[PDB]
Amino acid sequence: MSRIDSDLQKALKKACSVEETAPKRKHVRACIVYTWDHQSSKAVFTTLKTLPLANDEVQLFKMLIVLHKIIQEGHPSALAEAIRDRDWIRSLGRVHSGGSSYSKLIREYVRYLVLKLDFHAHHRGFNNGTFEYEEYVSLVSVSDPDEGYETILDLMSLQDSLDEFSQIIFASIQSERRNTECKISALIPLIAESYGIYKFITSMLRAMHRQLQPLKERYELQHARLFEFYADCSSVKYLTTLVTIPK
Amino acid sequence: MSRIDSDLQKALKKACSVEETAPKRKHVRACIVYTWDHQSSKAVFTTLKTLPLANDEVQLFKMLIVLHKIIQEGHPSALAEAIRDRDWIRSLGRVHSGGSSYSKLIREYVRYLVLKLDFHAHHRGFNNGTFEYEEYVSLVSVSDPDEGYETILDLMSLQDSLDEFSQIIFASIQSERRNTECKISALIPLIAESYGIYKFITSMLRAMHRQLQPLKERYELQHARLFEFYADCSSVKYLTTLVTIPK
Amino acid sequence: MSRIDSDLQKALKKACSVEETAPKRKHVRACIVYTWDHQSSKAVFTTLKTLPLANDEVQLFKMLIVLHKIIQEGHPSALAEAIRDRDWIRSLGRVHSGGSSYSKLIREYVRYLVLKLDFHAHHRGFNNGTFEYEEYVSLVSVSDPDEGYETILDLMSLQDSLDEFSQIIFASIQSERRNTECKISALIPLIAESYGIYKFITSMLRAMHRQLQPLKERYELQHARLFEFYADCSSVKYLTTLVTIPK
Amino acid sequence: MSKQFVRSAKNLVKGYSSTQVLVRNATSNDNHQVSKDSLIELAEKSYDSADFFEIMDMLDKRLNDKGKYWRHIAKALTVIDYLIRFGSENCVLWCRENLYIIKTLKEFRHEDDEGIDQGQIVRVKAKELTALLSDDERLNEERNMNI
Amino acid sequence: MSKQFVRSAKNLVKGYSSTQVLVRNATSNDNHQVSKDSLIELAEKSYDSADFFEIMDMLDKRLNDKGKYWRHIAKALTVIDYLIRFGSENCVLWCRENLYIIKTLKEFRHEDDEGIDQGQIVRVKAKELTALLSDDERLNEERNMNI
Amino acid sequence: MSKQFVRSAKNLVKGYSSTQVLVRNATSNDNHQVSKDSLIELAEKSYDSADFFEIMDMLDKRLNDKGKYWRHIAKALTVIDYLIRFGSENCVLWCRENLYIIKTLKEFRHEDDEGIDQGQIVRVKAKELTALLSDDERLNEERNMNI
Amino acid sequence: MSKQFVRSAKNLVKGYSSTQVLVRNATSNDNHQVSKDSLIELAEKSYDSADFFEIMDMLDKRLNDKGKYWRHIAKALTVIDYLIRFGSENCVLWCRENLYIIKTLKEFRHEDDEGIDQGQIVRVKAKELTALLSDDERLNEERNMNI
């Protein structure tokens, strides 16, 4: 450990706060703004490995919300270290064995993150947390269109798992009836990725459609799920306030 | 409402505090000590009727813990007003309809209180919250021993429901796994009544046994449940601290 | 005695201090407001026995003022307890016979108060401290007209005793040139009553006379005695620094 | 300047609610008249069984207060007049059911502060306010127009 | 040191009588067990029927008091236990009439990590003290010998 | 009034340069929209390469700042938006290199009941400001005309 | 008013015994002639041979005292005059042994324009008091009747 890591460690205690209220944007921001300042993210993972993490399941779900926001928002190093350490993330999926209801939310989030990180390592020449329309990756994909079809169908396989996990969170919210705040906070980064992945398939599909059929029928089902998910979020009386529309 | 009720109303907000931590002994004491000072308890029920009570199930279970401690600890008026208003207590059993797990704890507590208050109104010439060995009621009962047998068998029917409800709380504790504090707090007054009812049957049974058979076999099952319940409480790492032994 | 009674026992200790000024108004408010809060006044009469009286006459002189205000202002129980404890009030007149600068005044409160309480017990079915228009009891008094005539003409003999008591204290103020501060205070309850008793008889005399002569001459003699009192109390103008202007 | 900070510290120490701190800033030794937006906010708050207790409990503390603070009592009687005309029926039922603290204030008296007799402001407010509570027909008329 | 000056300043400001300052200096957060000379002085003072209330009303404040000062509640239970053993019968008649103030303490609880040990001293003194009020043959034997 | 004296006292105690006191007096909790003369003075001062850091380091403190002062973050986003439109190119090169400080604000959130409206002013200024850094043809057209 | 609070603060700080605080509150700059009940209480207290020195040593401080407080010297001469008439013989034996403290006052002088009138009250009390110590047949007749 070193004195610059101590500045970040103050924020990580407060972002993984002791109970099932939201992880404050102020402490998640302090980690993200650190991750850009120090150009690299080994300190943030080395902190999560040495944290009182697996002490109880409420803080371990908070840690997965915070860790998703840091990979998504942060410098490209946050994702590059997550591509290396996806097996540490996978180990978190084991440490509470799916018993009481709150543990099932953890296991489906770990399966989602391990799928996302597997997909960045395996498939794309693209390394941003949120997806965005990288022109060189799009041009090289449409120039290779049988792999281009595999790219939209594999990227759709993430949007399928994103959608299935959103229904786990919604059913778990509705069956518990009260203390929603951390569960709905977990919907916030999934909302931003849901729009980011949607914008990427839309822009890649447009490019491939003009550069050249059935992907439009698949796109209508994914678009139907997108508009269903934002209607489902519109019901949620806190979550709706802050995002300036779940787009 | 009147200015002396305002002194009690401050304590009742804090004893029914907004979430599933314990109801503090300091605020429950402020209500009990009021109830002895003003010799009467109509203000404490009139406050619970006009409270933001049925706003959410967490505060309604807290209110039933506090209301049990006030009937049990407080001046004989607290029980006499509870004997009049057992139908208001019964209405609380309806207001959350047994859905999410926390509501089932409320419905079994309301059934227990309505059974206790039915028993004081129906059966005994005895009006203390905790039971204790009232010599005149014991002498008049042993002087009437077919009703004396009905008295110990009816008082045993309360200890049966006390024991069945304790298993609802223990199973609900173990299935939820964490945030036990209000549920174990609900065990505290049930523990004091479990010993108080046990001391009364033991003292009444001794008196009736010497004043004159099968009630000793019933007493061994009730005693076995008593020693089982205090072993079950001994497991509980907070509750054990304060009672100076669950006797 | 119980803990709530400690609130009142502090206040009467400050009202019955060793200073020969008025009782501070804030302590008489504490005794009147206690009497209204607890809806029953027996603790004030008990506390008045517990106090060391006669041994320095400034305690007994003020204590008689304070009790007069409490009977007049307080909850109707203060009148009901004074109707019983009239024999203790009579004992206050005996205990310091002669042997003082102002024992005639001490006895003149006792004589006035005993006659006041005699009237409250027999001559009406009402129960209030300051005399006022109880609506049904007024209608009963015209229904029973000669008992109403005796009620108001005896109440005039009380008002003549109120006025002769005021002349006694005025003459005593003409004697106590070197030290007067409390003798004006002894007038204070008399002043407020003298206007209310005037209102009460004026309304009852007019309603009786018109519905059923020299009672108009009796009424004007009392009208003139009010203006004689209002002039006399204005001459002792230091009284106005305690009270309102007398009216 | 010192009182404005030190009162802000006493608000933290006693732990006061935002409802208590409003009522408390409204009724404060401060020589300024109680502002119309403060009075109408306490009337607007009255329609809540959770806040109405805190408002009436702080006004009942301030109506009790020592002689040194006649400034509190004068404002507290001002706030009660406004609350019975503008406010919820609970304000009137409360004020009618413990009238005696207002009616007992009517004799109040602080004196030789600098030489003057200082109670008359309390005594006029308490007299007209107790008259207005007793004139139930004037009060229900006044309320029905203003509401 | 400064808490001893500040405590003496608060004893001036509130204006407490010398009998109250004796009790509120005796049952105080200095945590030395309460002095045997002060206990017998309170037991002698208890026979003055005017000065009696000053002792017992301060012990009612100290038994009522916040959880942070478990120290007060423990010493106040000690001072009462001495006063029923060796003080005037008027202390027993007072303590019998409002027994509930102590009897409600039997379940008292405070925590700072290990603070359950501090709750234990309060609970055992409240339990012994209620056992002493309830054993009438013990208390009249004990008082007959002690007087 | 006293917060204006106290703020002037804190500006002495920390020893801030007159250029810092201009920014920290300009983007401050007085909540009047920031003055058009102060904005053009900061845009002129930005051309002094030594005094540049004093402006931008204070805006980095005000963009970093606590949630309680959403007022600072909104005005600091306004002062930056003017400085990229009408200040030196050195303010654009600084603001481009550490864009993340603003870009992370787009999701900012504060609450006091209705406080979501205050979060909205922060969010819309952060969104417009990142749209202005990202539209290079807009920003170089805008700067060519504004210079 | 504040001099009454400050005087009570100085009586704490120096730590004066309650018998000293009785004398130093009795013979003080409030300029109301000293109370007849306080004089007889000092005359009764004088019979306690331990507590005697606290009264007489404070009167030695007040007779020694600065010219600005001619008020102290006049009242201290009054308190001594009562104490030789109606107090213990121990006050006469003390006052006889150090007569010079009073006897030197006969020529005392203070001035503020008209302040010669204030010097006159000191001088006449010192002269009457030394006439009373010197007339032994007066003082033993006076004491025999007064006792």
Numbering used by the authors:
A (entry chain N), B (entry chain D), C (entry chain B): 1 to 212, 222 to 256
D (entry chain A), E (entry chain C), F (entry chain M), G (entry chain H): 1 to 147
Q: What does the publication say?
A:
Throughout this process in yeast, endocytic coat adaptors, Sla2 and Ent1, must remain attached to the plasma membrane to transmit force from the actin cytoskeleton required for successful membrane invagination. Adaptors Ent1 and Sla2 co-assemble at the plasma membrane in a phosphatidylinositol 4,5-bisphosphate (PIP2)-dependent manner through their epsin N-terminal homology (ENTH) and AP180 N-terminal homology (ANTH) domains, respectively. Here, we present a cryo-EM structure of a 16-mer complex of the ANTH and ENTH membrane-binding domains from Sla2 and Ent1 bound to PIP2 that constitutes the anchor to the plasma membrane.
Focusing on the most abundant complex (16-mer), the structure reveals an assembly of 8 ANTH and 8 ENTH units arranged into four tetramers, each tetramer consisting of two molecules of ANTH and two of ENTH (A2E2). The global resolution of the final EM map is 3.9 Å (gold-standard Fourier shell correlation threshold 0.143) with analysis of the local resolution showing higher resolution towards the core of the map, reaching 3.7 Å. The cryo-EM map shows that each A2E2 tetramer contains three distinct lipid-binding sites, harboring 5 lipids per A2E2 with a total of 20 PIP2 lipids resolved in the entire 16-mer complex. PIP2 was found in three different binding sites, one in the ENTH domain, previously known from the crystal structure, one in the interface between the two ENTH domains of one tetramer, and one in the interface between the ANTH and ENTH domains, acting as a ‘glue’ for the oligomerization of both domains. Within each AENTH tetramer, the interactions between the ANTH and ENTH domains are established through two main hetero-dimerization interfaces and one homo-dimerization ANTH-ANTH interface. Our structure shows that ENTH T104 and ANTH R29 are located in one of the observed interfaces, defined as “ANTH-ENTH interface 1”. A second interface in the AENTH tetramer involves residues K10, K13, and K14 of ANTH. Altogether, these results indicate that lysines of the ANTH-ENTH interface 2 are essential for the assembly of the tetrameric lipid-binding AENTH unit and for the AENTH function in vivo. Since samples were prepared above the critical micelle concentration (CMC) of di-C8-PI(4,5)P238,39, the position of the polar groups indicates that the core of the map is composed of a PIP2 micelle around which the ANTH and ENTH domains assemble. Our tetrameric structure suggests a mechanism of lipid locking as the anchor unit to the membrane that would enable force transmission coming from actin polymerization for invagination to take place.
